[PDB]
Amino acid sequence: SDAPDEFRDPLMDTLMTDPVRLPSGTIMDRSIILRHLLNSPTDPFNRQTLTESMLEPVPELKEQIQAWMREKQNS
């Protein structure tokens, strides 16, 4: 959509619906990063080692995105 960059996944440039934070500080869609971790236990960008347990959900951003979406449906 016309979604703000901050709402998009850094890797797939798709709208994030379940934003998680990588220890690096990078925020991704949970599905997307878990896909990557399946073949490589690393941060997709800085190459550091990474495991699922280290991901931290970003509820604030998730509500922000869901709201932005629900506001679009109301047009």
41/48 Cα distance (integer angstroms):
8
CATH assignment of the domain containing 17: 3.30.40.10
Who contacts 12 (Cβ-Cβ below 8 Å, separation ≥6)? Answer: 29, 32
Domain coverage including residue 33:
2-73
Number of domains the chain is built from: 1
Who contacts 31 (Cβ-Cβ below 8 Å, separation ≥6)? Answer: 18
List, comma-separated, the residues after which the chain is broken, a break being a C to N distance over 2.5 A; otherwise answer none: none
37/50 Cα distance (integer angstroms):
7
Residue 33 structure tokens: 């990063």
40 burial via Cβ count (<10 Å: 0-12, 13-18, 19+): exposed
What's the reported resolution, in angstroms, to a tenth?
Answer: 2.6
- Could you tell me how many residues make up the chain? 75
In 3D space, the residue among 29, 38, 37 whose CA is nearest the CA of residue 3 turns out to be 29
For residue 54, give the amino acid letter. M
Phi/psi for 49 (5° steps) reads -65, 140
Number of Cβ atoms within 10 Å of the Cβ of 27: 20
The approach used to solve this structure was X-ray
In 3D space, the residue among 63, 58, 17, 24 whose CA is nearest the CA of residue 44 turns out to be 24
